[PDB]
Amino acid sequence: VSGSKKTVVAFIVMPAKNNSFTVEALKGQAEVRALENTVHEVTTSIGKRIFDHAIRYPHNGLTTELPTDLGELLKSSDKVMLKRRILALRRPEGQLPPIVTHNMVDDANDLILNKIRQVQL
Amino acid sequence: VSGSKKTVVAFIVMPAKNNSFTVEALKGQAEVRALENTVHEVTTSIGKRIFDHAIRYPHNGLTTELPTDLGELLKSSDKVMLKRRILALRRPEGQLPPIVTHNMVDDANDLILNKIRQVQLFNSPSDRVKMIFHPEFLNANNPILGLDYDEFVRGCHLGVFPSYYEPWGYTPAECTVMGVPSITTNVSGFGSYMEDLIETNQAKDYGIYIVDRRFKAPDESVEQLVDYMEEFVKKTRRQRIN
Amino acid sequence: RDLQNHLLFETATEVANRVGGIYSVLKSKAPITVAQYKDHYHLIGPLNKATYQNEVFSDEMRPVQHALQTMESRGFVYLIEGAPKVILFDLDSVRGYSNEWKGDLWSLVGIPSPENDFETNDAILLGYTVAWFLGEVAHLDSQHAIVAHFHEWLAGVALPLCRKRRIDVVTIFTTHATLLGRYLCASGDFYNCLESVDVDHEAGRFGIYHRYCIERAAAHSADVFTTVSQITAFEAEHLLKRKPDGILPNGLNVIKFQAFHEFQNLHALKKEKINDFVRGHFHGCFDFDLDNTLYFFIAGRYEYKNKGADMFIEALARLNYRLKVSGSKKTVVAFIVMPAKNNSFTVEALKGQAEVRALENTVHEVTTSIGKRIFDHAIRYPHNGLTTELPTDLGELLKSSDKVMLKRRILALRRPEGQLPPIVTHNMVDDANDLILNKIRQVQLFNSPSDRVKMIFHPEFLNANNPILGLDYDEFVRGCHLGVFPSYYEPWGYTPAECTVMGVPSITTNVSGFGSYMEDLIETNQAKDYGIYIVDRRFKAPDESVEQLVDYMEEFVKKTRRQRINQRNRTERLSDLLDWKRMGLEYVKARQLALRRGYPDQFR
Ligand SMILES: O=P(O)(O)OC[C@H]1O[C@H](O)[C@H](O)[C@@H](O)[C@@H]1O
């Protein structure tokens, strides 16, 4: 209502009978972790390209002290990787981030979860 | 003359009397190291920005999976430090990369340096061959070229040992053991031994180049040595590797 | 007509649409055919309205444009490395002519055509259309000799008539299997009692009758008849009642490295990724040495009998016994990569990778503090009472808090008492009824520590986007040591052929089209040294075949590293033989022979 731009992420840390973490929980952590590593790879090559330009300037037809076009730094193979990682992070259409990290033993009767489902958060 | 795109950097590793490395040799390594570090900081920032875009797409007005404009990744403070690092690498106007890594004790009278000066290999940009005299034993403890001798050799493409007196060529032998082709002479004990075992035209293919310093005038020897060198420079990578 | 400056028309169902294994063959072969024919080369296929958008003249070539115009006159769509020119005919824009045509066909050659056989329907439509098109060209172009190559029963409806209508163009037909062959190989002895089978009856019994005809017709109608491998030639002789004029083995578009030994480095790199996975999978039960461990794998479509999953698993159980008996210190981790119906990765799979990944991070932390301490000592010596150049007591470097976190990480890796590393990475939809898992359970390969052979079913396509084994298929292979593909029905072994190209030795069979090609080129004992192991599945009982397969695995396990390395070099040099640069010559020979047979202008 107040048009606040802030977000609140509310954690409930109360032990309940469960069957460990959900596949989704672990899978998403990994998917992001994969994206982190690919970016680290891509930046390293960008670094080699920036460095080459910097050590080489003003020779070999380099008008500018630094690269100015992203194309000089970012190559199609780099892009393909990054795009693959981004695709892996996609959620099925209409699926929302869950309200629970674990597989519950008695999910339908759980008080906390039923409360959340009642207020529709 | 041939319009070759190749470059040859030629090292001379022969100990002479010296007063250690030049300030310029050390300062230039540091200036380049400082550039590498600055680049590493800048690519870290870039990473965070690429990552943020990737994780957030297609939300928050992100059309396109990836950044498309360099401005999104590279920012003014990043550019400033990079430029500062580049500026520090600038040499005085008209100065050329030296032909020696050390402060020689007897610079003016040195035979090697005088010869270079005489043939006028001063590492000008139009020179397709470059000269670097390292008047000291290679050692991994050295602060500019932190390699032991054996390591350095492995790094190189071609050993060139056109000896006149050499009962046994320890050097081109060690060079061969490291899988690096060499040029030797037929008045060299090593070159003689290799001349004996292999047909001299077949020996070039096994990376053994032998110069005639026996049945040829010193000026013909040289044109042979040069013929060899140029032949090698014409080689492709695949050929070099094989 | 000019024979030297000829035209080339290649036709297949699989042209712009990836329905099956011919797609890849045509695609990979494009660069060499384009390289030779330039603009003269055209691919022809059916228009796949759904996905054709994805994949997407000169005067001496002018007759084409008018023939297309003529086809456009009567109410057609004109890519991949080599970028060959394509013609995709919209079959919906001609569906109405079918009844006239299906009848034409029925009286034409007595090829029935049930209304249900939607695939045959399309096959026919295509055939009549293409035959019509080529016929147009044949008149309209008078300079060039024309070559019309056709792939598979589905595309070979245009062939039959070209003999009937006596069109001036020369024809080639290649079959990449046989209909009866597949169908007999329904359950089970194909290769032995083959010569003694009835083509017409058994077809009628299978219920193709109509589709069998179209294949047989195509094979007979064709000026030149070809298969992809000896074993299939033998098969096609007795089943399609025509000995083929030759073999057209499937080549690959081999990507050569500037440095020959680069594949060797790639192997080591990819193997590190598999090691990483394996460490996680065996978290808590990790009692062997990866430096002395070998990675075997089978891969392909889930075809338990056909692709030899049964023989593989049986053999592995036997090998396991041999290695235990012989006291071998080696370990073999056997992967099965065959897609099955699953509910994705197991929590345990993901959790163990995480647990290891956390250990790695804590170690990395601990080692950096150790570093600061080693450094301090080194830079300080000999001052401040430092007797020695380096630390000598681990206590100086490793502190209590460091030990605590490490210990916690180790604890998190523990598995429940008696629990063994799984034999499957995924939650299966129908676990109890799964054949592979049944077979594994039966031979009792449950990854116990005393087992020298380990089992890991991965019932899903490999993909670098996977969260546990983050490798594309090609990478995974490189990483492994031995591919093992003991197939039964396989007109051409795409798999062990790919495996060879990655410099990885493989076990194949003599009933496999690939294995047949290799047993012809190389003396079979000499071939093992080039990393091609061929199992006898023709002149041996299944039990003997298994024991042979085991012998081969045991032989390979006994190899040293140096030997393994060298053999891989040997197998990679061999990958040349599978390059289109060499395999495309057989296509040439087939095409030139096709000229000599039909329009033989030259005495010599
Ligand atoms: O996987 P293996 O058969 O033990 O191969 C091990 C070897 O792989 C490649 O050849 C690497 O270049 C070697 O450094 C490594 O030692």
Swiss-Prot record, chain A:
- Post-translational modification Phosphoserine, affected residues: 20
Where can this protein be found?
A: Cytoplasm, Cytosol
Summarize the PTM comment.
Phosphorylated by the cyclin-CDK PCL10-PHO85. Phosphorylation causes inactivation of enzyme.
The family this protein is said to belong to = Belongs to the glycosyltransferase 3 family.
Q: What does this protein do?
A: Glycogen synthase participates in the glycogen biosynthetic process along with glycogenin and glycogen branching enzyme. Extends the primer composed of a few glucose units formed by glycogenin by adding new glucose units to it. In this context, glycogen synthase transfers the glycosyl residue from UDP-Glc to the non-reducing end of alpha-1,4-glucan.
Assembly information from the UniProt record: Interacts with PCL10.
Miscellaneous comment as given in the Swiss-Prot or TrEMBL entry: Present with 14600 molecules/cell in log phase SD medium.
The name of this protein is Glycogen [starch] synthase isoform 2
In the record, what lineage is assigned to the organism producing the protein? Eukaryota, Fungi, Dikarya, Ascomycota, Saccharomycotina
From which residue to which, out of the full length, is covered? 344 to 464 of 705
UniProtKB/Swiss-Prot annotation, chain B:
Biological process (GO), any one: glycogen biosynthetic process
Q: What is its main location?
A: cytoplasm
Binding-site positions, UDP? 171
Keyword Phosphoprotein among UniProt keywords: yes
* Signal peptide boundaries: none
The terms under GO molecular function for this entry are:
alpha-1,4-glucan glucosyltransferase (UDP-glucose donor) activity; glycogen binding; identical protein binding
Protein localization = Cytoplasm, Cytosol
PTM per UniProt?
A: Phosphorylated by the cyclin-CDK PCL10-PHO85. Phosphorylation causes inactivation of enzyme.
For this record, the Gene Ontology CC terms, alphabetical, are:
cytoplasm; cytosol; glycogen granule; nucleus
Subunit structure, per the record?
Interacts with PCL10.
Q: Which family does it belong to?
A: Belongs to the glycosyltransferase 3 family.
UniProt name for this protein? Glycogen [starch] synthase isoform 2
Q: In the UniProt record, what gene is named as encoding this protein? A: GSY2
What range of the parent protein does this fragment cover? 344 to 585 of 705
